[PDB]
Design a protein around this ligand. Structure first.
Ligand SMILES: [Mg+2]
Ligand SMILES: [Mg+2]
Length: 664
DNA sequence: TGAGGTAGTAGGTTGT
RNA sequence: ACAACCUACUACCUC
């Protein structure tokens, strides 16, 4: 559809000068010849110690300052060791904004120059490359500030670029004893005053600090120098952030509270244009010209119930895109008896429209019966039950998870619906109903349209603490197809192992080969952030050998900055090319919208096309009912799948149908 | 546990 | 330590 012009929260500034396009170069020289694994955290530390504006350039420094006015000789204490540096001038070296390699450096210096010129300005705050200008609260002990977070790089032409985005700080000005005595509840986070390590403040200790055995609190922390200039308070039984179970005593005097809980797009645009003007001139960088880019309102998707719909909730009266014969059991954990009538009517209305038939069972049993309860589950499944609705008061995480896993071990997904529930809460129970139905394995909605790819799979990592899970969900059938998940696999990090990516992918290829009678002509591959170097290498090879076409795309929930209209309102579905191989996509519009940032990593489909499918896949998600997810359904699904599997383990899923969206 | 979202604390992996 | 992404909490708003 239409073109448009939009404002990016970037601003063009002055060209770099003849001296800036040619930094001085320096050769570092450390005493304890550097460790092989420490040279980066440390070389970056020397660039800072050098003074002036100077960054790391390979294994030396690039400086925008003549060596004569740098601290070329110093010492350095990192992780306990004391290294002694010495900087040697190695003349100067021109850099080419054209060459993105040398441009990497010019933007490194740019960030320094930015933060170093923010440092010398009175009446503000500089927590990193961010500035806090107009204070926001007088407060009573605690001060919350206004301001903005900034960034500053170079460009192809060789000009500075200044990204700007409004922000806030929540700072404390007292002690864990002083602030808590000032009349406020106990904090969740609490950082040491003599260090930067943090703890999960659990409780207070009804024990004497002096006579308390330390596997003595009074004697141990005082014999470190902490007792000076301060007065340790009472025992504060804290617990590690890594090991959440084991407590460790500590003094409420040596602790500071890490306070936390305690803008509109019209306004945000404003505040951004202001902060940019000021900074532009107090910086000697010129008048801030608001960069503009061409946008494109993408063609709205055709959501299909049985008849077309605007929201998945509508399928509840129009009928489902593909309903089958389905049995749903009810489990109540409160005292009550049967299905609330309005819930019965509602399901029946929706199932009538769709055609096929509905059986409504009841589970007369309670988890408290132990194995008996499972046996009741086994019979429900036996009578064709597919999912269960659980009416109950709010469960606690631990009991919630136990229940969910319990039912899944008998292949019953389940939807929880909290029980103080009045019929006029239509939004709640309709969403619960949608959840119930997707968990049962129905396709509640689909898309009408032709797309480049007939198979779209999303890959996420991680729902766990120590290790994580790599998983994939997919929409199969280009048609605007039907949805399914695959068994996740545990992994050490964020990187999904190459063999796993392929294997998960092949499960979706096979799902396709079972629905249509062929291989897909082309798959769209979504990844949930950075694509770790070469992660899809093996997978993409295989797709070739098999004759399947593909497109890979990093989809990033952050980094896309902001997008404002030159005039009018922001529409749903703005596609905004940028540096080739990357574009923003503004898929939804609380306050100010955060656009996805997408990087076409591999494959030869045009950006607009990828941007078309992705935006549309945004509306495929069946469990949201009255609002769409910012993310394509395949990645939203995978995100959920990876979280549920981390909440409650992989062991339970062996007998659950990949077509039943149990994690929604 | 109805589901979306922005936005403020914290901390983790990949990468040079 | 820095970038790039990711994640957890909580608060707030919405149909
Ligand atoms: Mg992720
Ligand atoms: Mg759900």
């Amino acid at each position: 559809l239409g073109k448009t012009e939009v404002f990016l929260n970037r601003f063009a500034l002055r060209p770099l000068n003849p001296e800036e396009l040619r930094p001085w170069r320096l050769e570092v020289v450390l005493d304890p010849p550097p460790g092989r694994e420490e040279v980066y955290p440390l070389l970056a530390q020397v660039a800072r110690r050098a003074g002036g504006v100077t960054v790391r350039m390979g294994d030396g420094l690039a400086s925008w300052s003549p060596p004569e006015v740098l601290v070329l000789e110093g010492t350095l204490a990192r992780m306990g060791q004391t290294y002694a540096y010495r900087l040697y001038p190695k003349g100067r070296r021109p850099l080419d904004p054209k060459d993105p390699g040398e441009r990497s450096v010019l933007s490194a210096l740019a960030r320094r120059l930015l933060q170093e010129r923010l440092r010398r300005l009175e009446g503000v705050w500089v927590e990193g490359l961010a500035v806090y200008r107009r204070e926001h609260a007088r407060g009573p002990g605690w001060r919350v500030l206004g301001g903005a977070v900034l960034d500053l790089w170079v460009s192809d032409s060789g000009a500075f670029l200044l990204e700007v985005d409004p922000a806030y700080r929540i700072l404390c000005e007292m002690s864990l004893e002083a602030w808590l005595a000032q009349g406020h509840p106990l904090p969740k986070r609490v950082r040491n005053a003599y260090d930067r390590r943090t703890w999960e403040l659990l409780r207070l200790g009804e024990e004497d600090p002096k006579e308390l055995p330390l596997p003595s609190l009074l004697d141990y922390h005082a014999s470190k120098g902490r007792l000076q200039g301060r007065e340790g308070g009472r025992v504060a039984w804290v617990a590690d952030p890594k090991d959440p179970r084991k407590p460790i005593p500590h003094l409420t005097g040596l602790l500071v509270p890490v306070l936390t809980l305690e803008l509109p797009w019209e306004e945000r645009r404003r505040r951004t244009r202001e902060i940019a003007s000021w900074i532009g001139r107090r910086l000697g960088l010129g008048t801030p010209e608001a960069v503009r880019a061409q946008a494109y309102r993408l063609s709205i998707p055709k959501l299909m119930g049985r008849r077309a719909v605007s929201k998945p909730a509508d399928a509840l009266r129009v009928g489902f895109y593909r309903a089958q014969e389905t049995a749903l059991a009810l489990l109540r954990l409160d005292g009550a008896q049967g299905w609330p009538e309005f819930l019965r009517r509602a399901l029946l209305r929706a199932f009538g429209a769709s055609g096929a038939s509905l059986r409504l069972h009841t589970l007369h049993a309670h988890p408290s019966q132990g194995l008996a309860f499972r046996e009741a589950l086994r019979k429900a499944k036996e009578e064709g039950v597919q999912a269960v609705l659980v009416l109950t008061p709010p469960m606690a995480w631990e009991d919630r998870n136990r229940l969910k896993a319990l039912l899944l071990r008998e292949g019953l997904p389940s939807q929880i619906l909290n029980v103080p529930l009045r019929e006029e809460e239509r939004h709640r129970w309709e969403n619960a109903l949608l959840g119930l139905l997707a968990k049962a394995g129905l396709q509640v909605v689909a898309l009408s349209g032709a797309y480049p790819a007939e198979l779209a799979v999303g890959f996420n990592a991680g729902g766990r603490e120590s290790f994580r899970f790599g998983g994939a969900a997919c929409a199969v059938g280009g048609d605007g197809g039907h949805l399914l998940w695959t068994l996740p696999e545990a992994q050490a990090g964020e990187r999904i192992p190459q063999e796993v990516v392929w294997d998960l992918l092949e499960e979706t290829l096979w799902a396709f080969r079972r629905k249509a009678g062929r291989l897909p002509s082309r798959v769209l591959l979504l990844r949930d952030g950075r694509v770790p170097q070469d992660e899809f290498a093996l997978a993409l090879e295989a797709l070739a050998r098999e004759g399947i076409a593909y497109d890979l795309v990093s989809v990033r929930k952050s980094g896309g900055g902001r997008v404002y209209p030159v005039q009018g309102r922001l529409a749903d579905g703005l596609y905004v090319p940028l540096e080739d191989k990357t574009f923003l996509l503004l898929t939804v519009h609380r306050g100010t919208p955060r656009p996805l940032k997408l990087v076409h990593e591999a494959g030869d489909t045009p950006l607009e096309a990828l941007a078309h499918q992705i935006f549309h896949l945004t509306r495929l998600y069946p469990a949201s009912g009255f609002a769409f997810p910012r993310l394509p359904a395949p990645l939203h699904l995978a995100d959920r799948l990876v979280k549920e599997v981390g909440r409650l383990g992989i062991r339970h899923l062996k007998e659950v149908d990949r077509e039943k969206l149990f994690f929604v």
